[PDB]
Amino acid sequence: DLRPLVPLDGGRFATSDLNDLYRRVINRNNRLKRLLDLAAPDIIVRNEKRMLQEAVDALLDNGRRGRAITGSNKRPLKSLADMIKGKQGRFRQNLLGKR
Amino acid sequence: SQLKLLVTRGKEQGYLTYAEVNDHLPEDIVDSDQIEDIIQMINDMGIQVMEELMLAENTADEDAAEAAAQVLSSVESEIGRTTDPVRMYMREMGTVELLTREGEIDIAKRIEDGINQVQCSVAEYPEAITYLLEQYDRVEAEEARLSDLITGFVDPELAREKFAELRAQYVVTRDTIATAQEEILKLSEVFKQFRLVPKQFDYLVNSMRVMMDRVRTQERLIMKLCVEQCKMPKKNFITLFTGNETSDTWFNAAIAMNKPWSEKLHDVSEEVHRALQKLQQIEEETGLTIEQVKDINRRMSIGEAKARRAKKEMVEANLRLVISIAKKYTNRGLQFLDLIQEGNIGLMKAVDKFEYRRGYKFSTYATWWIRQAITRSIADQARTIRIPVHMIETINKLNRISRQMLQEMGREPTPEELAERMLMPEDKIRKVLKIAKEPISMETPIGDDEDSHLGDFIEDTTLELPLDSATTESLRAATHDVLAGLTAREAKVLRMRFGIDMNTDYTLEEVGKQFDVTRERIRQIEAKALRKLRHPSRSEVLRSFLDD
Amino acid sequence: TPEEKLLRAIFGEKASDVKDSSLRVPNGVSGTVIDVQVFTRDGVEKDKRA
Amino acid sequence: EFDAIKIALASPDMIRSWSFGEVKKPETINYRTFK
Amino acid sequence: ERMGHIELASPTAHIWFLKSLPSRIGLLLDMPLRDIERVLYFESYVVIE
Amino acid sequence: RVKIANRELEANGKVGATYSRDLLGITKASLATESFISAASFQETTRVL
């Protein structure tokens, strides 16, 4: 209920980007588990570990190591760090002055 | 370096514009990504960069200032420093040789011998052949599918007689345990003409691995008790333990050594005798010695590693192949590297299923498997609300018959028209085209004044309004009043029958057991009380809670 | 819930299986209804007033 | 009610103690019955 | 209020403690930043005793 | 801090610290704040946390 997926008018849901980021971390983590239990060619395993690291960093603070990913609609997905910081964040805009 | 003068220039002026940053860069910095990252360095420290009363603030810093300055001084020499995944992978994939022009068949022969070494290694094992005769008898005695043991060979009934023949040969091999060596070679050469089911073979291999693990664990129980606790000496334990491996002299005639260490193993003496009897007993549980099956699975792991160290090479080449193939879906809602990873996994899949026997070139078939697995993973993990793969295929054929029906019929498809041209019942097509659309992001920038987002207007349909909680506490008070106007019979039985000011509302029998009366009396009492409550002077206050 | 339960079991007014979500005039607005337009999905029975 | 706000890193055992269960699959909900 | 946890099959550096400038990981080990991010992405190896 | 410490030492028999008063700008006198909640409020939050 902090990263909710809510039914809109017309059945087209609405989701916060944290679901995208958690999903990208979870797929890559499951694939790393898969490749580890296949004895895969270790260059592919290196790539999986690198991608999982990049995913965890997009999840923790997007646009802090490389370029913001991505988003699905061509705008930088916001992550937990974006949920805290920023003029339009959480410490400022509903924490100090609220409706 | 020159960027040092650039940083001090920005600090002098109090800013830095894109012109000066484009000037003062390391000339052969051809990488726009490290360009962006180095300007993000010079900005993340502060000064702030721009492109053209500039009195706001500094924000930083004496701690991160020298940090970013150090990173800049280093990055002045950062030659091969792309530092992003998609380019690092391309680097380390093109760096490896593309040494594959019908050397695939040589690699395949390597695998062929390596997979036959594991075959002969297992097939030299007595208890596994016992397991195989077991499963021939069970699969022909209806324990599983009739071919649930073998993947063909180099025919139900002559095959059952073949397996009876193999059973006779192996059981006489067991009968003639020197004399046993020639008969086990008989065993090996007579099984060498067969071919098992890879699942049964897999359990075979895993049982060999459990053999290895348990034998090494009893190795640990022998050694660590003295070789790791009493500090049993290394080379003497070597030349005595391995070299004897059977008799009591390795331990019973070694406790009589009275050495500085043989005066240390009387503690574990009976424990290592348990280990000795377990050695000889597991030799029975396997049928043959520990050394024999040990070196058996050793050479088998040799052959398996020999096979694996060639699939590595061909997956290198064919992973260049996969980066080739994958680029047709860069805008399918999935990351490019994730596409390449699914293609790599499918490539290993096809490499273990590629065959030279058809004489087909590798690429056309591995790309078959790769397109399969990549479209699979796209259909699987490209959408938050997972629709199954068949639904994705159905929406795809709907879309493909939609562009066609648009370019032909001029105006637009419609569910009537689509149920015409497609073979669906005019309503599941409705739900399909309802399903296809993506959840809009809850951080969509709304067209408002406050920089508002779509997540700020999503109201709450589960909350009960505080007029509707103070219209329930008022009701609780009203019912407690109107029940107080009543005997303990009616009050207790109504609080108990319903959930009023109590835990779970009981049925009639529980109320009766609390009142020691039968259920029909309870029904009469509660009906009496409700009758009493129905009239005004007991109903006016409750009824005002009914706006109906 | 409870005692709401008892207040519906006393006066016997059933719990309707339908929720009210009708379109009503805003608060403060007061004007004649000068028009009504009804659109329907294709292949759905038009009511008496459509 | 509560005095000062303490802060630190998070031990993996502490992060396992926060959680009420692992998350193994990337599934949000069903597409027909939205449970 | 309930939280979950994903069990990373491989470790993963906290980007806050690798790009905090100074890198807390980096300045704790006294290993400069580019060396850390070069052992990170498997560009190199680092001995450990 | 130095005021209270060297004052309670002056009450003692030990020589206090000879301080020298600095002078900062408002956007740096605010940067140094005891409570990390407020500091995360009006500063770079990632650095503060």
Short mmCIF file of all heavy atoms in Angstrom, two decimals, chain B residues 263-311:
data_model
loop_
_atom_site.label_atom_id
_atom_site.label_comp_id
_atom_site.label_asym_id
_atom_site.label_seq_id
_atom_site.Cartn_x
_atom_site.Cartn_y
_atom_site.Cartn_z
N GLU B 263 49.65 -41.23 20.53
CA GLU B 263 49.19 -40.93 21.88
C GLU B 263 48.09 -39.87 21.88
O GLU B 263 47.84 -39.26 22.92
CB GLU B 263 50.36 -40.48 22.75
CG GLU B 263 50.15 -40.68 24.24
CD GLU B 263 51.47 -40.72 24.99
OE1 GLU B 263 52.44 -40.09 24.53
OE2 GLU B 263 51.53 -41.39 26.05
N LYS B 264 47.45 -39.65 20.74
CA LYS B 264 46.39 -38.65 20.60
C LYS B 264 45.12 -39.20 19.96
O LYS B 264 44.10 -38.51 19.99
CB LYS B 264 46.88 -37.46 19.77
CG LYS B 264 47.70 -36.45 20.55
CD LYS B 264 47.93 -35.20 19.72
CE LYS B 264 48.82 -35.50 18.52
NZ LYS B 264 49.85 -34.45 18.30
N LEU B 265 45.16 -40.40 19.39
CA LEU B 265 44.02 -40.97 18.69
C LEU B 265 43.34 -42.09 19.47
O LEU B 265 42.46 -42.76 18.93
CB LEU B 265 44.46 -41.47 17.31
CG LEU B 265 45.46 -42.63 17.31
CD1 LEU B 265 44.75 -43.95 17.07
CD2 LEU B 265 46.56 -42.39 16.29
N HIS B 266 43.73 -42.30 20.73
CA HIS B 266 42.98 -43.22 21.58
C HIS B 266 41.64 -42.61 21.98
O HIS B 266 40.69 -43.34 22.31
CB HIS B 266 43.79 -43.57 22.82
CG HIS B 266 44.23 -42.39 23.62
ND1 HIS B 266 45.26 -41.56 23.22
CD2 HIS B 266 43.78 -41.88 24.79
CE1 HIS B 266 45.42 -40.60 24.11
NE2 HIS B 266 44.54 -40.77 25.07
N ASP B 267 41.55 -41.28 21.96
CA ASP B 267 40.27 -40.61 22.14
C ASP B 267 39.27 -41.04 21.07
O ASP B 267 38.20 -41.57 21.38
CB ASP B 267 40.47 -39.10 22.11
CG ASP B 267 39.18 -38.33 22.27
OD1 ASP B 267 38.31 -38.77 23.05
OD2 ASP B 267 39.04 -37.28 21.61
N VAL B 268 39.62 -40.82 19.80
CA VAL B 268 38.72 -41.14 18.69
C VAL B 268 38.81 -42.60 18.25
O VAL B 268 38.31 -42.94 17.18
CB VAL B 268 39.01 -40.23 17.48
CG1 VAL B 268 38.44 -38.84 17.74
CG2 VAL B 268 40.51 -40.15 17.23
N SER B 269 39.46 -43.45 19.06
CA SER B 269 39.74 -44.83 18.65
C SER B 269 38.47 -45.58 18.25
O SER B 269 38.37 -46.09 17.13
CB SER B 269 40.47 -45.57 19.77
OG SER B 269 41.00 -46.79 19.31
N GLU B 270 37.50 -45.67 19.16
CA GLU B 270 36.27 -46.38 18.83
C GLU B 270 35.48 -45.64 17.75
O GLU B 270 34.82 -46.27 16.92
CB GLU B 270 35.43 -46.59 20.09
CG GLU B 270 36.20 -47.29 21.20
CD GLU B 270 36.24 -48.79 21.03
OE1 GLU B 270 35.16 -49.41 21.03
OE2 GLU B 270 37.35 -49.34 20.90
N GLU B 271 35.57 -44.31 17.74
CA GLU B 271 34.91 -43.54 16.68
C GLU B 271 35.49 -43.85 15.31
O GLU B 271 34.75 -44.01 14.34
CB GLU B 271 35.00 -42.04 16.98
CG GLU B 271 34.15 -41.59 18.16
CD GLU B 271 33.35 -40.33 17.86
OE1 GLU B 271 33.64 -39.66 16.85
OE2 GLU B 271 32.43 -40.01 18.63
N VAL B 272 36.82 -43.98 15.21
CA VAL B 272 37.41 -44.28 13.91
C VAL B 272 37.22 -45.76 13.58
O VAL B 272 37.24 -46.15 12.41
CB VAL B 272 38.89 -43.87 13.89
CG1 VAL B 272 39.60 -44.49 12.70
CG2 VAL B 272 39.01 -42.35 13.84
N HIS B 273 36.96 -46.60 14.59
CA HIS B 273 36.55 -47.96 14.26
C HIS B 273 35.14 -48.00 13.68
O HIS B 273 34.87 -48.77 12.75
CB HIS B 273 36.65 -48.86 15.49
CG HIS B 273 36.59 -50.32 15.17
ND1 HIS B 273 35.85 -51.23 15.91
CD2 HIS B 273 37.17 -51.04 14.18
CE1 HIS B 273 35.99 -52.43 15.39
NE2 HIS B 273 36.78 -52.35 14.33
N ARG B 274 34.23 -47.18 14.22
CA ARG B 274 32.94 -46.98 13.58
C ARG B 274 33.11 -46.50 12.15
O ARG B 274 32.40 -46.95 11.24
CB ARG B 274 32.09 -45.98 14.37
CG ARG B 274 31.53 -46.50 15.68
CD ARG B 274 31.98 -45.62 16.84
NE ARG B 274 31.67 -44.21 16.64
CZ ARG B 274 31.05 -43.46 17.54
NH1 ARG B 274 30.67 -43.98 18.70
NH2 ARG B 274 30.81 -42.18 17.29
N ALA B 275 34.05 -45.59 11.93
CA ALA B 275 34.31 -45.11 10.57
C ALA B 275 34.85 -46.22 9.68
O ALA B 275 34.53 -46.28 8.49
CB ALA B 275 35.27 -43.92 10.61
N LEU B 276 35.67 -47.11 10.24
CA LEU B 276 36.22 -48.23 9.48
C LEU B 276 35.12 -49.20 9.06
O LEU B 276 35.05 -49.63 7.89
CB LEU B 276 37.27 -48.95 10.34
CG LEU B 276 38.14 -50.07 9.76
CD1 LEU B 276 39.56 -49.94 10.27
CD2 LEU B 276 37.57 -51.42 10.15
N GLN B 277 34.26 -49.58 10.00
CA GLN B 277 33.16 -50.46 9.68
C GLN B 277 32.17 -49.80 8.73
O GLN B 277 31.58 -50.47 7.89
CB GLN B 277 32.45 -50.92 10.96
CG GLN B 277 31.75 -49.81 11.70
CD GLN B 277 30.25 -49.92 11.60
OE1 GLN B 277 29.66 -50.90 12.05
NE2 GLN B 277 29.62 -48.93 10.99
N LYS B 278 32.01 -48.47 8.82
CA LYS B 278 31.19 -47.76 7.84
C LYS B 278 31.83 -47.78 6.46
O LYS B 278 31.13 -47.88 5.46
CB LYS B 278 30.96 -46.32 8.30
CG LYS B 278 29.57 -45.79 7.98
CD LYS B 278 28.51 -46.43 8.86
CE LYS B 278 28.70 -46.05 10.32
NZ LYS B 278 27.63 -46.60 11.19
N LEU B 279 33.16 -47.66 6.40
CA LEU B 279 33.89 -47.82 5.15
C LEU B 279 33.55 -49.14 4.49
O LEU B 279 33.06 -49.19 3.36
CB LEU B 279 35.39 -47.75 5.43
CG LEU B 279 36.03 -46.38 5.61
CD1 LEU B 279 37.12 -46.43 6.68
CD2 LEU B 279 36.61 -45.91 4.30
N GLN B 280 33.81 -50.24 5.21
CA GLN B 280 33.55 -51.56 4.66
C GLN B 280 32.06 -51.80 4.39
O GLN B 280 31.73 -52.51 3.43
CB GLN B 280 34.10 -52.64 5.59
CG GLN B 280 35.58 -52.49 5.90
CD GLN B 280 36.20 -53.77 6.45
OE1 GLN B 280 35.55 -54.82 6.48
NE2 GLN B 280 37.45 -53.68 6.89
N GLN B 281 31.17 -51.21 5.19
CA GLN B 281 29.73 -51.39 5.00
C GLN B 281 29.21 -50.63 3.79
O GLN B 281 28.36 -51.15 3.05
CB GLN B 281 28.99 -50.94 6.27
CG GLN B 281 27.53 -50.62 6.08
CD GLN B 281 26.93 -49.93 7.29
OE1 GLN B 281 27.49 -49.98 8.38
NE2 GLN B 281 25.77 -49.30 7.11
N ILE B 282 29.68 -49.41 3.57
CA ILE B 282 29.32 -48.67 2.37
C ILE B 282 29.93 -49.31 1.14
O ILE B 282 29.36 -49.20 0.05
CB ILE B 282 29.75 -47.19 2.50
CG1 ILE B 282 29.11 -46.56 3.74
CG2 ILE B 282 29.39 -46.41 1.25
CD1 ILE B 282 29.65 -45.19 4.07
N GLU B 283 31.08 -49.98 1.28
CA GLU B 283 31.57 -50.79 0.17
C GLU B 283 30.57 -51.86 -0.22
O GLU B 283 30.42 -52.17 -1.41
CB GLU B 283 32.92 -51.42 0.52
CG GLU B 283 34.04 -50.41 0.77
CD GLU B 283 35.41 -50.95 0.38
OE1 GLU B 283 35.73 -52.10 0.75
OE2 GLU B 283 36.17 -50.22 -0.30
N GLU B 284 29.87 -52.44 0.76
CA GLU B 284 28.77 -53.36 0.48
C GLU B 284 27.57 -52.66 -0.14
O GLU B 284 27.01 -53.15 -1.13
CB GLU B 284 28.31 -54.06 1.77
CG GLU B 284 26.92 -54.68 1.68
CD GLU B 284 25.84 -53.80 2.28
OE1 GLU B 284 26.19 -52.78 2.90
OE2 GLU B 284 24.65 -54.12 2.12
N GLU B 285 27.16 -51.53 0.45
CA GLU B 285 26.01 -50.78 -0.04
C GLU B 285 26.20 -50.37 -1.50
O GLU B 285 25.24 -50.20 -2.25
CB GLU B 285 25.76 -49.57 0.85
CG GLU B 285 25.58 -49.93 2.32
CD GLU B 285 25.81 -48.75 3.25
OE1 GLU B 285 26.45 -47.77 2.83
OE2 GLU B 285 25.35 -48.81 4.41
N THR B 286 27.46 -50.18 -1.91
CA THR B 286 27.78 -49.98 -3.31
C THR B 286 28.16 -51.27 -4.02
O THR B 286 28.16 -51.30 -5.26
CB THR B 286 28.92 -48.97 -3.45
OG1 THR B 286 30.06 -49.43 -2.72
CG2 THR B 286 28.48 -47.61 -2.93
N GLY B 287 28.48 -52.33 -3.29
CA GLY B 287 28.86 -53.58 -3.91
C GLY B 287 30.36 -53.76 -4.08
O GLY B 287 30.91 -54.80 -3.70
N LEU B 288 31.03 -52.75 -4.63
CA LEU B 288 32.48 -52.78 -4.80
C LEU B 288 33.15 -51.81 -3.84
O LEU B 288 32.51 -51.19 -2.99
CB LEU B 288 32.87 -52.47 -6.25
CG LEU B 288 33.05 -53.67 -7.18
CD1 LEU B 288 33.53 -53.22 -8.55
CD2 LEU B 288 34.02 -54.68 -6.57
N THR B 289 34.46 -51.68 -4.00
CA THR B 289 35.27 -50.94 -3.05
C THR B 289 34.95 -49.45 -3.10
O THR B 289 34.23 -48.96 -3.96
CB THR B 289 36.76 -51.16 -3.33
OG1 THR B 289 37.10 -50.59 -4.60
CG2 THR B 289 37.09 -52.65 -3.36
N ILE B 290 35.53 -48.72 -2.13
CA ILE B 290 35.42 -47.26 -2.14
C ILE B 290 36.36 -46.67 -3.18
O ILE B 290 35.99 -45.74 -3.92
CB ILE B 290 35.72 -46.70 -0.74
CG1 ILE B 290 37.02 -47.27 -0.19
CG2 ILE B 290 34.58 -47.00 0.21
CD1 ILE B 290 37.32 -46.82 1.22
N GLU B 291 37.58 -47.19 -3.27
CA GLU B 291 38.55 -46.71 -4.25
C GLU B 291 38.02 -46.85 -5.67
O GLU B 291 38.18 -45.93 -6.48
CB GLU B 291 39.87 -47.48 -4.10
CG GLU B 291 40.45 -47.55 -2.69
CD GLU B 291 39.83 -48.65 -1.84
OE1 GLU B 291 38.75 -49.15 -2.21
OE2 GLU B 291 40.40 -48.98 -0.78
N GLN B 292 37.38 -47.98 -5.97
CA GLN B 292 36.93 -48.26 -7.32
C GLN B 292 35.90 -47.24 -7.78
O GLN B 292 36.12 -46.53 -8.77
CB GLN B 292 36.37 -49.68 -7.41
CG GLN B 292 35.64 -49.98 -8.71
CD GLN B 292 36.56 -49.93 -9.92
OE1 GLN B 292 37.72 -49.53 -9.82
NE2 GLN B 292 36.04 -50.35 -11.06
N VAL B 293 34.77 -47.16 -7.08
CA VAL B 293 33.71 -46.22 -7.46
C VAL B 293 34.20 -44.79 -7.33
O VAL B 293 33.75 -43.90 -8.07
CB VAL B 293 32.45 -46.46 -6.61
CG1 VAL B 293 31.76 -47.78 -7.00
CG2 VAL B 293 32.78 -46.43 -5.12
N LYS B 294 35.12 -44.53 -6.39
CA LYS B 294 35.67 -43.19 -6.22
C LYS B 294 36.40 -42.74 -7.48
O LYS B 294 36.08 -41.69 -8.05
CB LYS B 294 36.60 -43.16 -5.01
CG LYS B 294 37.10 -41.77 -4.62
CD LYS B 294 38.42 -41.45 -5.31
CE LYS B 294 38.86 -40.02 -5.07
NZ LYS B 294 40.18 -39.74 -5.70
N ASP B 295 37.37 -43.52 -7.94
CA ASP B 295 38.05 -43.16 -9.18
C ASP B 295 37.12 -43.26 -10.38
O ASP B 295 37.33 -42.57 -11.38
CB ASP B 295 39.29 -44.02 -9.37
CG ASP B 295 40.49 -43.47 -8.63
OD1 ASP B 295 40.67 -43.80 -7.44
OD2 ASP B 295 41.25 -42.68 -9.23
N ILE B 296 36.09 -44.09 -10.29
CA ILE B 296 35.07 -44.16 -11.33
C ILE B 296 34.43 -42.79 -11.52
O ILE B 296 34.49 -42.19 -12.61
CB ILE B 296 34.01 -45.22 -10.99
CG1 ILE B 296 34.52 -46.63 -11.34
CG2 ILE B 296 32.70 -44.91 -11.68
CD1 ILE B 296 33.59 -47.73 -10.90
N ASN B 297 33.80 -42.27 -10.47
CA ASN B 297 33.17 -40.96 -10.57
C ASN B 297 34.20 -39.85 -10.75
O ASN B 297 33.86 -38.79 -11.27
CB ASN B 297 32.27 -40.69 -9.36
CG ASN B 297 32.93 -39.85 -8.28
OD1 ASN B 297 34.07 -40.08 -7.89
ND2 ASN B 297 32.21 -38.84 -7.81
N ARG B 298 35.46 -40.09 -10.36
CA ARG B 298 36.51 -39.12 -10.63
C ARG B 298 36.73 -38.96 -12.13
O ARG B 298 36.69 -37.85 -12.66
CB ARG B 298 37.80 -39.56 -9.93
CG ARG B 298 39.04 -38.92 -10.50
CD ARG B 298 40.28 -39.71 -10.15
NE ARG B 298 41.48 -38.94 -10.45
CZ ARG B 298 42.09 -38.92 -11.63
NH1 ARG B 298 41.61 -39.63 -12.64
NH2 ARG B 298 43.18 -38.18 -11.79
N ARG B 299 36.99 -40.07 -12.82
CA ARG B 299 37.15 -40.01 -14.27
C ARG B 299 35.87 -39.56 -14.96
O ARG B 299 35.91 -38.89 -16.00
CB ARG B 299 37.62 -41.37 -14.81
CG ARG B 299 36.52 -42.39 -15.03
CD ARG B 299 37.10 -43.76 -15.39
NE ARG B 299 37.79 -44.39 -14.26
CZ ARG B 299 38.46 -45.53 -14.33
NH1 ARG B 299 38.54 -46.19 -15.48
NH2 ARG B 299 39.04 -46.03 -13.25
N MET B 300 34.72 -39.87 -14.36
CA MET B 300 33.45 -39.37 -14.90
C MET B 300 33.36 -37.85 -14.80
O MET B 300 32.90 -37.19 -15.73
CB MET B 300 32.28 -40.03 -14.18
CG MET B 300 30.94 -39.44 -14.53
SD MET B 300 29.61 -40.62 -14.29
CE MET B 300 29.84 -41.05 -12.56
N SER B 301 33.77 -37.29 -13.67
CA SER B 301 33.78 -35.84 -13.53
C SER B 301 34.83 -35.22 -14.43
O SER B 301 34.67 -34.09 -14.91
CB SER B 301 34.02 -35.45 -12.07
OG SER B 301 32.80 -35.38 -11.34
N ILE B 302 35.92 -35.94 -14.68
CA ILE B 302 36.90 -35.51 -15.68
C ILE B 302 36.22 -35.35 -17.03
O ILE B 302 36.34 -34.31 -17.69
CB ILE B 302 38.07 -36.51 -15.75
CG1 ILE B 302 38.74 -36.63 -14.39
CG2 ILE B 302 39.07 -36.06 -16.78
CD1 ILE B 302 39.61 -37.86 -14.26
N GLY B 303 35.51 -36.39 -17.47
CA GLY B 303 34.85 -36.33 -18.77
C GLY B 303 33.77 -35.27 -18.82
O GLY B 303 33.61 -34.58 -19.83
N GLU B 304 33.04 -35.09 -17.72
CA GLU B 304 32.00 -34.06 -17.68
C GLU B 304 32.60 -32.67 -17.76
O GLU B 304 32.08 -31.80 -18.47
CB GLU B 304 31.17 -34.21 -16.41
CG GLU B 304 30.12 -33.12 -16.24
CD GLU B 304 29.00 -33.55 -15.32
OE1 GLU B 304 29.14 -34.60 -14.67
OE2 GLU B 304 27.97 -32.84 -15.24
N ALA B 305 33.70 -32.43 -17.04
CA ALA B 305 34.36 -31.13 -17.12
C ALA B 305 34.96 -30.90 -18.50
O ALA B 305 34.94 -29.78 -19.02
CB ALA B 305 35.43 -31.02 -16.04
N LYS B 306 35.50 -31.96 -19.10
CA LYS B 306 36.00 -31.88 -20.47
C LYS B 306 34.89 -31.46 -21.43
O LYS B 306 35.12 -30.66 -22.34
CB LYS B 306 36.58 -33.23 -20.88
CG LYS B 306 36.72 -33.44 -22.38
CD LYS B 306 36.59 -34.91 -22.72
CE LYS B 306 37.78 -35.40 -23.54
NZ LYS B 306 37.65 -36.84 -23.92
N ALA B 307 33.69 -32.01 -21.24
CA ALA B 307 32.57 -31.60 -22.06
C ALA B 307 32.19 -30.14 -21.80
O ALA B 307 31.99 -29.37 -22.73
CB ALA B 307 31.37 -32.51 -21.81
N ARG B 308 32.12 -29.76 -20.52
CA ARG B 308 31.66 -28.41 -20.19
C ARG B 308 32.64 -27.35 -20.68
O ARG B 308 32.23 -26.23 -21.00
CB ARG B 308 31.45 -28.29 -18.68
CG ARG B 308 30.45 -29.27 -18.11
CD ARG B 308 30.03 -28.88 -16.70
NE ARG B 308 31.15 -28.91 -15.77
CZ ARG B 308 31.87 -27.85 -15.43
NH1 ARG B 308 31.58 -26.66 -15.95
NH2 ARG B 308 32.88 -27.97 -14.58
N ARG B 309 33.92 -27.69 -20.77
CA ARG B 309 34.93 -26.70 -21.13
C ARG B 309 34.99 -26.48 -22.64
O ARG B 309 35.92 -25.83 -23.13
CB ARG B 309 36.29 -27.12 -20.59
CG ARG B 309 37.25 -25.97 -20.36
CD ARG B 309 38.61 -26.48 -19.90
NE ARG B 309 38.73 -26.50 -18.45
CZ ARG B 309 38.32 -27.49 -17.67
NH1 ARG B 309 37.76 -28.57 -18.21
NH2 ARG B 309 38.47 -27.42 -16.36
N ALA B 310 34.03 -27.02 -23.37
CA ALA B 310 33.85 -26.80 -24.80
C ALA B 310 32.53 -26.12 -25.11
O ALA B 310 32.47 -25.27 -26.02
CB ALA B 310 33.94 -28.14 -25.53
N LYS B 311 31.47 -26.47 -24.38
CA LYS B 311 30.24 -25.69 -24.43
C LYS B 311 30.51 -24.23 -24.09
O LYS B 311 29.86 -23.35 -24.64
CB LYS B 311 29.21 -26.29 -23.47
CG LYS B 311 28.76 -27.69 -23.84
CD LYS B 311 27.84 -28.28 -22.78
CE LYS B 311 27.22 -29.58 -23.27
NZ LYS B 311 26.48 -30.31 -22.20
#
